[PDB]
Design a protein around this ligand. Structure first.
Ligand SMILES: [Fe+3]
Length: 329
């Protein structure tokens, strides 16, 4: 029955957030939940802000959910996105490696190629791919960024430190950590491949379909499978790197307004969910892709009482992330 300060990362999400606020004002009764928009430069500033009681919520890729839980932030997942459809809700998605047809190389031949990542620490764009190549990277493997920059002959790893790891922003100077960087996120990583800046793009299964509407254009891209073979992009179920947890909304563990967050999102998905309204769309926008929430999401599911980041992500996934920051071969 009160205000939820949503954290928007940069200008594009801020605009979508303002529209979200305005439309909710015209559908929700005077005594219903409302939205306020707090603009920050990166997802990292959003995490600090929430922990500092400057904002209340933000949606994060699962990989980033782990960081959010560590002290002194101690945020917890309260609401998760679900994909697929309302009839068959999927609380996970597939991480894939997209390349152009006949580029002439397999998964075990990535050394020296140029890579495009959605962002440092994210599930599909970093943790899965780098987790699988870990023992392929040259030594020392510490720091991780260092060895990654030496494996590929140039890449775009948004949010990485370009001062110490220049090679990680060769394809996107500055390694901007928001949509101001044309190569940020799923669709940014895809564009990086499409434009020809990189040789491979680590994204999710729906990315190409979200960007190329003619099957004729998609037939010019393939997927790299673990068994060093290539398959068409429609065959991701038989050619993916891993299954990762859906993105989730995080909030403070104390005075986190988790009840209001859910009330707001549940009502938001009622009035503005998929195909629900002509005035405003929660899972789409003319100002960009994957703003505030992923375009591929179909709705929200409440997370069980007091579930911590570790239990939510699962031991397996949480294992991989640890093995990446410590890792041995
Ligand atoms: Fe993701």
């Amino acid at each position: 029955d009160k205000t939820v300060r949503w954290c928007a990362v940069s200008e594009h999400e801020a605009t979508k957030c303002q529209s979200f606020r305005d439309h909710m004002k015209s559908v929700i009764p005077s005594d219903g939940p409302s939205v306020a928009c707090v603009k920050k430069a990166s997802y990292l500033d959003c995490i600090r802000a929430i922990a500092a009681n400057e904002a209340d919520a933000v949606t994060l890729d699962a990989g980033l959910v782990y960081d959010a839980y560590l002290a002194p932030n101690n945020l917890k997942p309260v609401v998760a996105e679900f994909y697929g459809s309302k009839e068959d809700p999927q609380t996970f998605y597939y991480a894939v490696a997209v390349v152009k047809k006949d580029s002439g190389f397999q998964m075990n031949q990535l050394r020296g190629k140029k890579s495009c990542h959605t962002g440092l620490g994210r599930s599909a764009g970093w943790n899965i791919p780098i987790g699988l190549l870990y023992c392929d990277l040259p030594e020392p493997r510490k720091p991780l960024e260092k060895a990654v920059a030496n494996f590929f002959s140039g890449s775009c790893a948004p949010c990485a430190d370009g001062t110490d790891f220049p090679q990680l922003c060769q394809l996107c100077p500055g390694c901007g950590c928001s949509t101001l960087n044309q190569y940020f996120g799923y669709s940014g990583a895809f564009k990086c491949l499409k434009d020809g800046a990189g040789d491979v793009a680590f994204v999710k299964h729906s990315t190409i379909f979200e960007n190329l509407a003619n099957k004729a254009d998609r037939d010019q891209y393939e997927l790299l499978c673990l068994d060093n073979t290539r398959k068409p992009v429609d065959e991701y179920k038989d050619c993916h790197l891993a299954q990762v947890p859906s993105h989730t909304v995080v909030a403070r563990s104390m005075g986190g307004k988790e009840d209001l967050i859910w009330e707001l999102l549940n009502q938001a998905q009622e009035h503005f969910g998929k195909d629900k309204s002509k005035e405003f769309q929660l899972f789409s926008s003319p100002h960009g892709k994957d703003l505030l929430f992923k375009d591929s999401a179909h709705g929200f599911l409440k997370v069980p009482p007091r579930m911590d980041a570790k239990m939510y992500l699962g031991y397996e996934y949480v294992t991989a992330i640890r093995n990446l920051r410590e890792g041995t071969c």
